[PDB]
Amino acid sequence: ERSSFPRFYFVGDEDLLEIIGNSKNVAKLQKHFKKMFAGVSSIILNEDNSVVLGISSREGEEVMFKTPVSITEHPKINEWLTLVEKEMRVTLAKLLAESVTEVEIFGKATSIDPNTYITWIDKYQAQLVVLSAQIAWSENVETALSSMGGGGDAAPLHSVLSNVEVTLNVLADSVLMEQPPLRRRKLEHLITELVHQRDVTRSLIKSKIDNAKSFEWLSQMRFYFDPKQTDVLQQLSIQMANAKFNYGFEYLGVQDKLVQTPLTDRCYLTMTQALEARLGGSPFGPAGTGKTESVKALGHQLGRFVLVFNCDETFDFQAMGRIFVGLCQVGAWGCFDEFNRLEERMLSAVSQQVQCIQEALREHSITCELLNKQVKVSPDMAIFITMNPNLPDNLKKLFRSLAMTKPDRQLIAQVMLYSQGFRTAEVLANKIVPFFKLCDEQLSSQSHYDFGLRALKSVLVSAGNVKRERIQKIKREKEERGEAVDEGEIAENLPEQEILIQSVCETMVPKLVAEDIPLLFSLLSDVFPGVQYHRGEMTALREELKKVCQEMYLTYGDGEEVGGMWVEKVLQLYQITQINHGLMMVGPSGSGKSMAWRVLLKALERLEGVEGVAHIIDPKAISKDHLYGTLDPNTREWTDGLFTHVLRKIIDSVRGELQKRQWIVFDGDVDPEWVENLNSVLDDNKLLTLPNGERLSLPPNVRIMFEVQDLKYATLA
Amino acid sequence: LFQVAFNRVARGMLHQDHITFAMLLARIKLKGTVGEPTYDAEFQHFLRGNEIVLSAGSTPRIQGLTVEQAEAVVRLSCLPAFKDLIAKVQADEQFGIWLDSSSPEQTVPYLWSEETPATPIGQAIHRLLLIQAFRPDRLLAMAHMFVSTNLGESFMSIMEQPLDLTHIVGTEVKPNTPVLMCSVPGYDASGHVEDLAAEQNTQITSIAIGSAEGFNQADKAINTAVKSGRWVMLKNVHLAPGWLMQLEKKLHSLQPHACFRLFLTMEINPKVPVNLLRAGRIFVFEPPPGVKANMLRTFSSIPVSRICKSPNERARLYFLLAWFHAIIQERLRYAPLGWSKKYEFGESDLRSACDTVDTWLDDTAKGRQNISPDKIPWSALKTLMAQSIYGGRVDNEFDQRLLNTFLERLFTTRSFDSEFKLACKVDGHKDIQMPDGIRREEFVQWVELLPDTQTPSWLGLPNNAERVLLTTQGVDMISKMLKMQPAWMRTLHTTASNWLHLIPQTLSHLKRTVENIKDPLFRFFEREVKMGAKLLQDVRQDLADVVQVCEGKKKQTNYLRTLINELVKGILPRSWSHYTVPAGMTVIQWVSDFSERIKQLQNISLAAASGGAKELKNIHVCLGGLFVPEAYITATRQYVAQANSWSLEELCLEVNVTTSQGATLDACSFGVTGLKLQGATCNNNKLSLSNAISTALPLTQLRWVKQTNTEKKASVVTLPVYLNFTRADLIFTVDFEIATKEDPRSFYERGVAVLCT
Amino acid sequence: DPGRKPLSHRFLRHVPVVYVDYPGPASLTQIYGTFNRAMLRLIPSLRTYAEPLTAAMVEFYTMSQERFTQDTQPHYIYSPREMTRWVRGIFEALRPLETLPVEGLIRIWAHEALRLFQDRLVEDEERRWTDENIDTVALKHFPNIDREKAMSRPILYSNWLSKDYIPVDQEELRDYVKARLKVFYEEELDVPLVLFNEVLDHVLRIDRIFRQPQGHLLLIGVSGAGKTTLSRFVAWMNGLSVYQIKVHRKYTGEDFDEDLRTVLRRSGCKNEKIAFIMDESNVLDSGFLERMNTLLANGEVPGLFEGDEYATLMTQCKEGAQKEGLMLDSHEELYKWFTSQVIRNLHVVFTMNPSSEGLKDRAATSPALFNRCVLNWFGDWSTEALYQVGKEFTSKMDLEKPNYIVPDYMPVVYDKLPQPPSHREAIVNSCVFVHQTLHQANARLAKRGGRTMAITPRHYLDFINHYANLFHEKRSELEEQQ
Numbered sequence A: 001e002r003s004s005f006p007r008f009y010f011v012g013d014e015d016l017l018e019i020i021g022n023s024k025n026v027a028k029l030q031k032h033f034k035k036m037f038a039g040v041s042s043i044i045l046n047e048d049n050s051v052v053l054g055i056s057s058r059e060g061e062e063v064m065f066k067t068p069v070s071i072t073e074h075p076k077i078n079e080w081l082t083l084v085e086k087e088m089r090v091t092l093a094k095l096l097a098e099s100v101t102e103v104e105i106f107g108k109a110t111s112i113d114p115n116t117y118i119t120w121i122d123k124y125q126a127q128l129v130v131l132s133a134q135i136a137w138s139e140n141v142e143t144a145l146s147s148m149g150g151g152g153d154a155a156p157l158h159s160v161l162s163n164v165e166v167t168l169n170v171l172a173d174s175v176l177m178e179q180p181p182l183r184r185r186k187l188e189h190l191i192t193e194l195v196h197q198r199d200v201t202r203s204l205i206k207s208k209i210d211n212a213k214s215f216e217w218l219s220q221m222r223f224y225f226d227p228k229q230t231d232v233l234q235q236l237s238i239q240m241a242n243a244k245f246n247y248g249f250e251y252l253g254v255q256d257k258l259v260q261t262p263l264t265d266r267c268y269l270t271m272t273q274a275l276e277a278r279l280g281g282s283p284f285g286p287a288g289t290g291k292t293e294s295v296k297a298l299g300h301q302l303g304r305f306v307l308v309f310n311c312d313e314t315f316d317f318q319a320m321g322r323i324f325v326g327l328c329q330v331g332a333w334g335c336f337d338e339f340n341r342l343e344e345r346m347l348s349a350v351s352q353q354v355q356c357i358q359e360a361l362r363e364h365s366i367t368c369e370l371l372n373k374q375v376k377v378s379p380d381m382a383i384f385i386t387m388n389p390n391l392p393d394n395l396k397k398l399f400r401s402l403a404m405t406k407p408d409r410q411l412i413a414q415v416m417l418y419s420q421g422f423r424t425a426e427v428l429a430n431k432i433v434p435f436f437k438l439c440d441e442q443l444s445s446q447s448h449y450d451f452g453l454r455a456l457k458s459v460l461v462s463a464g465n466v467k468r469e470r471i472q473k474i475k476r477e478k479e480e481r482g483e484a485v486d487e488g489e490i491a492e493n494l495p496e497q498e499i500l501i502q503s504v505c506e507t508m509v510p511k512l513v514a515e516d517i518p519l520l521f522s523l524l525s526d527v528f529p530g531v532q533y534h535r536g537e538m539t540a541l542r543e544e545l546k547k548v549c550q551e552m553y554l555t556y557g558d559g560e561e562v563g564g565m566w567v568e569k570v571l572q573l574y575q576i577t578q579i580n581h582g583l584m585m586v587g588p589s590g591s592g593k594s595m596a597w598r599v600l601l602k603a604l605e606r607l608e609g610v611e612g613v614a615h616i617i618d619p620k621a622i623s624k625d626h627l628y629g630t631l632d633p634n635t636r637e638w639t640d641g642l643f644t645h646v647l648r649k650i651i652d653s654v655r656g657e658l659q660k661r662q663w664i665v666f667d668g669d670v671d672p673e674w675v676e677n678l679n680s681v682l683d684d685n686k687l688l689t690l691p692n693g694e695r696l697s698l699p700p701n702v703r704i705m706f707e708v709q710d711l712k713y714a715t716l717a
Numbered sequence B: 001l002f003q004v005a006f007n008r009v010a011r012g013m014l015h016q017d018h019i020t021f022a023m024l025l026a027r028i029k030l031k032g033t034v035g036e037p038t039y040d041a042e043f044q045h046f047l048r049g050n051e052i053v054l055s056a057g058s059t060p061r062i063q064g065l066t067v068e069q070a071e072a073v074v075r076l077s078c079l080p081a082f083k084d085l086i087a088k089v090q091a092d093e094q095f096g097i098w099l100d101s102s103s104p105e106q107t108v109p110y111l112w113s114e115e116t117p118a119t120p121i122g123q124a125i126h127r128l129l130l131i132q133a134f135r136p137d138r139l140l141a142m143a144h145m146f147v148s149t150n151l152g153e154s155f156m157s158i159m160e161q162p163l164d165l166t167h168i169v170g171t172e173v174k175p176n177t178p179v180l181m182c183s184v185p186g187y188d189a190s191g192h193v194e195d196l197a198a199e200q201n202t203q204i205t206s207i208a209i210g211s212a213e214g215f216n217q218a219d220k221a222i223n224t225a226v227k228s229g230r231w232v233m234l235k236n237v238h239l240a241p242g243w244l245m246q247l248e249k250k251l252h253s254l255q256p257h258a259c260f261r262l263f264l265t266m267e268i269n270p271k272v273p274v275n276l277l278r279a280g281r282i283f284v285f286e287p288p289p290g291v292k293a294n295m296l297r298t299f300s301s302i303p304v305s306r307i308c309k310s311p312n313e314r315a316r317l318y319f320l321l322a323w324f325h326a327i328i329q330e331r332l333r334y335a336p337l338g339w340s341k342k343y344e345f346g347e348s349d350l351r352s353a354c355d356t357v358d359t360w361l362d363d364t365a366k367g368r369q370n371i372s373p374d375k376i377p378w379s380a381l382k383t384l385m386a387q388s389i390y391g392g393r394v395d396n397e398f399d400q401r402l403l404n405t406f407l408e409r410l411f412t413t414r415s416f417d418s419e420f421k422l423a424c425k426v427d428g429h430k431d432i433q434m435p436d437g438i439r440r441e442e443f444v445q446w447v448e449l450l451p452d453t454q455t456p457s458w459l460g461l462p463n464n465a466e467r468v469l470l471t472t473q474g475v476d477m478i479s480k481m482l483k484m485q486p487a488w489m490r491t492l493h494t495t496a497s498n499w500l501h502l503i504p505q506t507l508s509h510l511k512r513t514v515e516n517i518k519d520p521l522f523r524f525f526e527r528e529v530k531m532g533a534k535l536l537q538d539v540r541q542d543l544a545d546v547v548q549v550c551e552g553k554k555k556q557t558n559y560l561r562t563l564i565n566e567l568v569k570g571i572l573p574r575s576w577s578h579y580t581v582p583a584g585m586t587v588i589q590w591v592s593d594f595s596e597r598i599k600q601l602q603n604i605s606l607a608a609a610s611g612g613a614k615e616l617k618n619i620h621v622c623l624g625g626l627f628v629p630e631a632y633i634t635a636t637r638q639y640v641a642q643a644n645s646w647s648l649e650e651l652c653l654e655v656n657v658t659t660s661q662g663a664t665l666d667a668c669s670f671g672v673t674g675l676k677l678q679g680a681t682c683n684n685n686k687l688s689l690s691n692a693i694s695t696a697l698p699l700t701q702l703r704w705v706k707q708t709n710t711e712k713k714a715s716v717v718t719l720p721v722y723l724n725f726t727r728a729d730l731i732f733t734v735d736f737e738i739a740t741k742e743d744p745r746s747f748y749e750r751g752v753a754v755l756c757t
Numbered sequence C: 001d002p003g004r005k006p007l008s009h010r011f012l013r014h015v016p017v018v019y020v021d022y023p024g025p026a027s028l029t030q031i032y033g034t035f036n037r038a039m040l041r042l043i044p045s046l047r048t049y050a051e052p053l054t055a056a057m058v059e060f061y062t063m064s065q066e067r068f069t070q071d072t073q074p075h076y077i078y079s080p081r082e083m084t085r086w087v088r089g090i091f092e093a094l095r096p097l098e099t100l101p102v103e104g105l106i107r108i109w110a111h112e113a114l115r116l117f118q119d120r121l122v123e124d125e126e127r128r129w130t131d132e133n134i135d136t137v138a139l140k141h142f143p144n145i146d147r148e149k150a151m152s153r154p155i156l157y158s159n160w161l162s163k164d165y166i167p168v169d170q171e172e173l174r175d176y177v178k179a180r181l182k183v184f185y186e187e188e189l190d191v192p193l194v195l196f197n198e199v200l201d202h203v204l205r206i207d208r209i210f211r212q213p214q215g216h217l218l219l220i221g222v223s224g225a226g227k228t229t230l231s232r233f234v235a236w237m238n239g240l241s242v243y244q245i246k247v248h249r250k251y252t253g254e255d256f257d258e259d260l261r262t263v264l265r266r267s268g269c270k271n272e273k274i275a276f277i278m279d280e281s282n283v284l285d286s287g288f289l290e291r292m293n294t295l296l297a298n299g300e301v302p303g304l305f306e307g308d309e310y311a312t313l314m315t316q317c318k319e320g321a322q323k324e325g326l327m328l329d330s331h332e333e334l335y336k337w338f339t340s341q342v343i344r345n346l347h348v349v350f351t352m353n354p355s356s357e358g359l360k361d362r363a364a365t366s367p368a369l370f371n372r373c374v375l376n377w378f379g380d381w382s383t384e385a386l387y388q389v390g391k392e393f394t395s396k397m398d399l400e401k402p403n404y405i406v407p408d409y410m411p412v413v414y415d416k417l418p419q420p421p422s423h424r425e426a427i428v429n430s431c432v433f434v435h436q437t438l439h440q441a442n443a444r445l446a447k448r449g450g451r452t453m454a455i456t457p458r459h460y461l462d463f464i465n466h467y468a469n470l471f472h473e474k475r476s477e478l479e480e481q482q
């Protein structure tokens, strides 16, 4: 059973026994499918549960099978799982062929109809639209170069640049107006890919390249699509420098797209060259520069599903060994996290294992002995190991290295801002990146401060959302007063530095201590001169706060008055609740967090008319297993834990609590033991999983809130 | 006995420590013989010269002597025997010629004054003192000739000879004793022992140590050879230290055959068990330090069939690749200058580069006997060896720029002409010449006929690079000898009392004010003053605890115990070091640097107290003194931006290095002192190459001007600034305009940089 | 204080804290004057001395607390617990006796003061200071008393000669303990034991601790000084059954738990009094220490008895209650009766090697071990003890020379050496000096920082035995030739 369909090598042996016991039940296989795949979360099945119609993702995007496979005809679990994989690969290939045909139809066109482009984007998945855009652009550039092959001829490459420019303008226009979130992410991926294509085309124009075999064009990633080939898996040939690989054709759902900085392209080139010479790469460097996500992006672009072995105290071996032999079997990639954090014995053992598999890979240029089993090495297999300065002695001769010394933050911010529809993106990025550089060093050091690159990306996304809210509000006001509605007409008039300052104030000021606020305001004055942001006070909320504080005997003050700081803190808490579904009111005991959120809840109930219900839960008083729920060793019955019980009661909507506002205040200390299960909740997914396998979606009204005293032991994640 | 002890100890010692052990044996013999005196004072000064503290007024600034030369000569004159030395330095005229002589140790002038003639060993040690004071770069050769004078000229005459391994394996070693071959990275000693086995007609078993099956094969081979008397071999034995201890334990209680001999080729790393090192005869193998030797090794490693392929131009490409690899590998030895850190440019980079060249020449030349030089994919090789290979380990941007300069200078269509120069002006006007041959044999012959007089100008560095390396090796000599040779309670009491007397008493904080809070320079200086005051209080309290412990009034706490242990051993305490320090800096010089830093901090605190932020602007700080100078440059940037209401991103840094008295305090200008220039001299903000090791910039002015959006001229160069001499941390980059007829690439290859200290 | 962790500020926000320090000197005066007035009601003729007695007690306790500060040694803590134990001991000694003049009362006061405030001291000058303080306070508060009779230096109290706990002369105690040692030699171990004064004081202290209930005692002193041998002697002489757990590398916590269960059921079910002998080499893990402090604090460790062991224990306790005459059915009452019998029969005596920083370590992880135990400084064999050992062991052979001439100057290391030192006396003093000079040499090596090996009285015994063998052999051969 284990050898056939090696994709369940990654799931646990106990989970293997569970899936064997649950063989005649497809409804309980969803967790395993989440585990072994990349972004696949559930298989779409009919009401009968005899044939699988298609696959879906965590976000909700789904793929439909051209020829669905019936489980009844092939009852064996491994047999129809292999059929599912093969049919998913074939369907992705065929949809990619359709999408490239479409994009070349809109390709080589003077003008682009926004309606047709939006319909095309909605028709196909994000990975497929990005891949089709890349294929079409690469083929167009290759054809234009071939026309230039005569030597000093007329330049059709300017036509390619103009087409990319008008497509980018269309995307920038489209992203500005309100869109569904999935189509929003699709647009963002498409526009960052097109920005990279535009920049590389500009470089090609500047270099006056005239030959299709010139190394200047060879260095950039080229996509070759061959619709005539019979084998669907080999249809797409991704080729860059000397190395050339086939597309993995595995579903990725929707993934964050890296901006392709010049250093990112350097990492791409180095890893690809290492893989061509049949040895892995070791992108060492300080933490926080996107090494592991660089490897993830390289794998995703190739269509290969990558493993992130987070190496900390949670790291294991027996599971590590079986998932490693599975990686060897399937051919998927595996990217280790920080390797220097292992125990010396631990590090030596994994080093010997990876040395053995790497020797097998070089021999393939074929089986290797893993757990006393000879394992055929797939040529597509690749392993990447990242340091935080070194590599063990048995691996130095076996692995290439690269310096992840510092990412190009300016280009990262410029591309991300341009993806949000911001105009003058380059100026804003060149201002904001040094601003965070100043923040990281001039501000007083604290444990909860985070001025990293992820902070930049989060702040920039929040700024984009703030701009969208402002344009929607102005559109509503224009509908009320007058009728002349034009998105661009408000767009170019609308200031944008104010929006960035508002976003950074709304996201960053709350984390500041009482002393750091003047320093932050001075930094905004220095980097963004003359421009200031004043938060629009919510007068109705202020009156409700006054009335509730009077009713609860609390003190009230505005600004410099007694209680002003507390009121501003409550207002910032309200804003974070508005823009986030997860909160942590960190502060010393005796600061007033509890009844601050209490008065905010009561004022919100008395203003908006939505009844407020709070469920105060202490995480440390009760044990983690009882907090989340017990797993029955024999019947697998679900004795829902306290938090799980509250969530299920809220979800069931027995007494209309969905219409009510629910705040799950987690008063008590926080440590990375119970919060690991809640980590899947505080992300944008907003799903909660259970050890039995049931997964629950979080209603929009529920707001997870942490009331903790200090963050000496809370992980930065 | 002396000779055999040296010839048996040095066979398993690094080449730089041979002379250290030689002088140790020389001191042993000097004490042993009765005729000559003990020379305690001379050796004590020769080992402890540098910890004698001086003053600025104690240096008379003699003409023809540098500052460090002045300190050395006055310190040497503190000895009563050399009291009249400075008078003869001023009086003598032949001193000037001898000071810059190529070999000053051969003809050391007679300067030391004495009433009676001295023994030849006394003359030798006096010349040792003079050489150390005047020309420390020859201290290694001076030591060589001193040991030759003491124990005989041919005392080291065995070390230069090749390893007579056959005699050592045959007799003088027991069959129980395993022969140990510890080789530095990038070398394998298996060849010598394999050839020895071939010439002795003795069959050996070559087993590599990679995994458990390797362990089993090694154990089976050992069990067979212990009774059959044959030899065994193990490769990279260092991989399994626990199995190494197990093998040592098994070897201890086992009687071997007379003919049995056990070999273990190893790597030099801490992980190897100490017990095997103690219980076996070790051998150290180091590659010969030469460009010609590196080329010979490279051309021997690469199979002759692979170089001679269908394109005849391949051999030229392989020769060029070998030259580049050798040039970088021999630049590695000059770590502060040749690079910024010791990278691992091992043989794997060579193999990857060879494979890349092979595949790209196969791609471009599809089985063509000849291919035109312009059709060779120069861009592909340059880009790959700049970014993927030889570039992956490169983390600093400036080393990457240096690598780009090397590749662009070497790999080009110009390289295929008969007038190609692999180096420029190696000695005087002579320069190396690229071979005109097209076959591998021609290049091998050409490298074999190399002049064998390699100077640092062969590989790009200025000729004085050898001088700095030799001086550093001499300093390492002195440190190793000093390390090689209760009362310690009294000595620590004395040194702690001296440090309390030397270190400033207290440092005043800065007075916070709303206007001062608004000013960014005041914020930076207040943070610096707080850090300095906290660390000064910590150091003063710790030393007070130490001195109280010396009198017995207090008992040694565990943290106190560690502090005293680290002090007596001379290691820098961890609790004291909160700012970036050179790795090898000892405690005494750390305390001196701290005294200077606290003095500067007191100066700025007094200046701020007297006035305010406006007076805080025109203070000529030294970047070395400040704990984080990049914070200072950022603070100046913010100050000028606030003053002129400009964005921080639209500002660029310009440098106008002028004399201290001839400086204008413009509102956008800040005074920076103590900056030192390496490998060049500035004149009217114009850079010029020179052989001087370091030029002191009188006063560097930092001016911030708006970004003009004009492309930089071809005459300006970007010079990195490093805080310390090891060049481990980067502060910022300046832009300097070089003088006429100068090549920026030549600036780049010579490792020119600005040092804060 | 060790073993305590600061509570979270969040919790402290809710529960205000009130500090209860040691009672004030006037508070102590009243709080124990009431007790003394109650206790002195037993004997009417000395009721007028109660208040000055309490005044002297509180003055001495205050001076001892102000002088022997915790910083010097970790066990220099004097709480009103010590004063309560003092008054309880005085009342216990005064209970069976019906009449006593003032001098006997002051002698019992001095005996209890020596047994409480001078017993735990480490250094000798501390003991001499404490003796001087006792003399001074007895003179100041109680002037009209015969000094020699009230506080004669050999203060030895025992109940083995008479029916009552009256003072006992050291010579009579020596003879009685010699007879008891003869019996011990005949039945139990037959190794020599020489009775220097220190042995008499130590056996009296250990017996006093054993007789009282829940008596757990802390033996600290140089290894080889006789701690376990003397403890075994007292155990047999008090009727206690000696028990020490055999330890080795295989001896894990499970084996210790089984031995704890065995000793607990022997001391709580069969009504068999047991003496638990415990050693630092016998304690291989801090789990042993935590279980021991829990046992000596609560009297019964809940972590020993579960499941089948629990059922067997209740069966045994039911049988024991049935044979005793107590009818109990539920497990709770039976468990309480078992705990009572344990705290009544279980006396654990455990020895510690002398290491001041170690006492910091052991007291750090063991709260009750330094609190609910009595600490006695066995120390090393003093010069007088060494001289007695030398005289007794070097007695068989003829170490007598009529030709000996008394030197004008004698190092007189032994203070009570006879002024005409005989050959045997002189050579015994020389052996004492050789031990002393090895001690000095070890101290000097410690001062210079070199590694030193502690010198123990077992080294003295080995030296004497080697003397015996060498002298016998050489003299035998040479007299054979003679």
Ligand SMILES: Nc1ncnc2c1ncn2[C@@H]1O[C@H](COP(=O)(O)OP(=O)(O)OP(=O)(O)O)[C@@H](O)[C@H]1O
Residues within 6 Å of the ligand: A554, A555, A556, A563, A566, A587, A588, A589, A590, A591, A592, A593, A594, A595, A596, A667, A707, A708, A709, C010, C013
């Ligand atoms: N605006 C206010 N005016 C007056 N009193 C206030 C105000 N806000 C809070 N308090 C008082 O201050 C205290 C705050 O209690 P609270 O439980 O909120 O503290 P906390 O810092 O969150 O504590 P913990 O860490 O235990 O959760 C209470 O006594 C409350 O009555």
Ligand SMILES: Nc1ncnc2c1ncn2[C@@H]1O[C@H](COP(=O)(O)OP(=O)(O)O)[C@@H](O)[C@H]1O
Residues within 6 Å of the ligand: A257, A258, A259, A260, A261, A264, A286, A287, A288, A289, A290, A291, A292, A293, A294, A407, A412, A453, A454, A457
């Ligand atoms: N090339 C890139 N483009 C865009 N964002 C990036 C890029 N590289 C890194 N990031 C961001 O920086 C962060 C890097 O996180 P992480 O992978 O933990 O760094 P490291 O690789 O040092 O472990 C991520 O949150 C990611 O969003």
Ligand SMILES: Nc1ncnc2c1ncn2[C@@H]1O[C@H](COP(=O)(O)OP(=O)(O)O)[C@@H](O)[C@H]1O
Residues within 6 Å of the ligand: C191, C192, C193, C194, C195, C196, C199, C221, C222, C223, C224, C225, C226, C227, C228, C229, C230, C351, C458, C461
């Ligand atoms: N007072 C004494 N007289 C004679 N021998 C003694 C005396 N005290 C101890 N010993 C000897 O010490 C040995 C064991 O000492 P021990 O009681 O184990 O020391 P400790 O218990 O202090 O570690 C016995 O063999 C005994 O002969």
